[PDB]
Amino acid sequence: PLREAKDLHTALHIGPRALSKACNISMQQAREVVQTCPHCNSAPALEAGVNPRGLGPLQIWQTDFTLEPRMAPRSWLAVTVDTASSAIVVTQHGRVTSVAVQHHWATAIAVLGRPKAIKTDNGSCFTSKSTREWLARWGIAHTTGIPGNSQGQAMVERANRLLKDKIRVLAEGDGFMKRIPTSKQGELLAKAMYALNHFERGENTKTPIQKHWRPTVLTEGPPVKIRIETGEWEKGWNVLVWGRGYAAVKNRDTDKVIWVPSRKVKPDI
Template structure:
C-alpha cells in the first residue's frame, strides 16, 4: 500500500563507477556496511506509515501491531534513501582526505590511495559510526585480488565476474532477456560490436510472454560462442597514474553501428595503449532525431526538387537510390473519372478500409474531398455508426463542414443514427448504387494511396499501439502538404484552405454523346486527365475530356458571351490536344 502511494525518487547514480579509472599505483581497500538498511532510522513522523499487524491463528488472542523504525526492505525508495544516507556519512571523510578516491554504491565502499594506513581505516570507521553505520569485519578486503560490485580487481585491470554463458535446453523469453542483461553489463569490457549481438537482440522481436519458447538459430549459437571466446581474454587495463593522465577517444567503423574505445597512450602495455573502456551503441537507439523531412517520410522527386531547389534529374536519382521509395510509385487519387465537387467542402466521399499494420486499430475510416483531394483518416477498432460519427466529427474539426457526403450502402452509413447525425449538421447524405464500386472510385483510390504510403512509412512491420496516431498523422501530412496531384501546381491542403479569388473560367465548346454536334461557348469549371466539367444553366455537367475543346471565336463574340460571367482567359493552351 505504501509503494502505491509513494512517488518514486529515482536512482541517484546512473550506473556503476568505472573501476579501471583507479590508477595501478594506488592501494585498495574494500569494505561492506553491515545491515545497512536496518541501520538507517526512519523519521518519527513517518513510522506510523509503516505499521503492520501479525495475525493470530484462528483469532485465539489479540493481534500484535508493530511499526518499522528503520528503513524497510521492499519499499520503493529504500535503495535511493540508502545511497543518500551513506553519501552523507562519507562526505566528512572525503573532505578530510581529498587525495583519496572513495567510491560507494549502496552499502559497498571502495577506498584507493597511495598508502592505506590504519589511521585511514579508523577515520573511515569513525565517519560511518557517527551516522550509526557499522563495517562488517568479515567483509573487509585489503589484498588483491578483490571483489567489488561484481568485478574482480587485480593489479592490471578490473573485469566483471561472469560464468560461462550458454543456452538452456528450452530457451524462454525471460532466459534470453537475462542473458542479454549480462551481455549489456560486460560489453564495455570486451571488443564486442553491436553487430555480433544482433542475432540475439533480433530474437526478442515478436515475443511478449515471459514463458514463450524461442527457437535457437545457428547465428545465435555463433554469437554466444564468440562472446565466450572473448571472455577468456583481458581487453581493458587500469590507468597507470592520475598525474597528467591523458585519455583519448577512438571511433571505429564497425558493421551495423560504430564502436569506440577510451584509452590512454601513457602505458607499458605491449600494444602501447591502455584501453580503459569499450563503448558500444545500443542495438535499438532510445530516440531518433530527424533534421530533414526526407528522414521522416518518403518524398517523390517533384517534392524534393521544389523543397531543396535542386534539378528534377538529380531528385529522380536520389529517389531511385532509396530502397523504399523505388519500390512503388505513390499514386494521387484525383485522376479517376468520377463525379466530384466543383469547390472544396462541396462533396466528400467516405469509406472504411482494413489494414493489419495498425492492429488493433485496423479499421481505418477515410474521407476525401472530391474537389481539393484533401484526405483525412481515423484508425478505430470498429466500423459501427458510432465509429463513423466519431470519424466524421474529426473530419469536421480538420477540414470543415461539407455540403454533402457520399458513401456506399454499408450498414453504418445507411443506419438511422448516422442519417440523424447528418440531418442535425445540415449535411446531405448520398448513397451510391448497391454493389457498384465505381461510384466510390475516388475514395477507393485514396485507400490504395494511404496504404501504400503507410507501408513505406512502417517498412512492412506492424505499428506499435502507442505510435499509431503519430504514424497516421505523418502519412496524412505527406499526402496533404507535400505531394502534388497530377496537373496541379498546389498541394491538396493549399487548394482546400486557400481563400484567394478563383481564376476566370475559359470558354469551351462541348458535345454530349451520342449527339456529335458541338455546342458552346460555355464556361469551363474543372478539367483533369480524362474528365471535365462545364457550366450548363448554372449547374456543373461532367463530360469526358475528349468531348471538350477550346472555343474559337472572334473578340466581339467572346465579349458578348462573357458579359454575364467572369472575363475569359486568353491563354487556353493547356486544353490543346
C-alpha cells in the same frame, strides 16, 4: 453483282472485305449488305459516363473503410476526402460500428470545416438509424451510390490505395515488416496525414491544404468546343474546371453546371 452477295451473307455471315473480294463488289454494297444482318453488330456501343466531382471546398465528400493488417488490433480505418481539394483525413477504430463512424466525421469536421454532402457506399452502419439522425442533427446531406459498385466513390477508394501505400512505405522504412507496435500507430497515422496533405502529389503545383483553404475558382470559363450528345462538337459553352481526368462545362444561357467526360470537350477557335 449484289444478289449473290446478299445470299452469301444471309447463309454465311461473311465480313465486308471478303464479300467485296469474292463477288467483285466495292466499298458501299459490301457495307450496306453487311449491316442488313442484325447479327453482324450487337454489342459495339457501350456508353461510359464517368463523372463524380464537387466544385468548391466543403461541398462534396466521400468516405470508405479500410482493413489494414499493420494497424492491429485496431486495423479498421475510416478515410474521408474532399473532392474539391483532395485533402484526406483518416481515423482509426476497432469496429465498423456506427459509433466509430460518428467519431471519424467530427474529427474530420474539426480539421476541414463543415461540408454539405458526404457520398458513401451503403455500408451496414452508414445507413444506420443513429447515424442518419445524428447527421440530420448536424444538418448536412447524405447520398449513396448505386448499391453494389464500389466504383462511383472512386476518389475515396483511390485515396485509400494511396494512403495504404504511404503507410506501408513508412512502416517498413522504419523496421516493422509485418505490423506496428501499439506505441507507433498514432504517430504513423499523423505523419501519413502530414505527408499527403501539406505537400504536392505528382505534378500539380498547388498543395492540397492550400488548395482547400485558398482555392481558386473561375467565375467565367473560356470558350470551348463541346461534344454535346447530338453526335458532334457544339460551339458556345465555357469550361469551368478541366481536370486531367475529367472536366465540367457551363452553358452560356441556361447556366448549367455538368460533369462531362474530358474527351467530350476541346478548345474553341
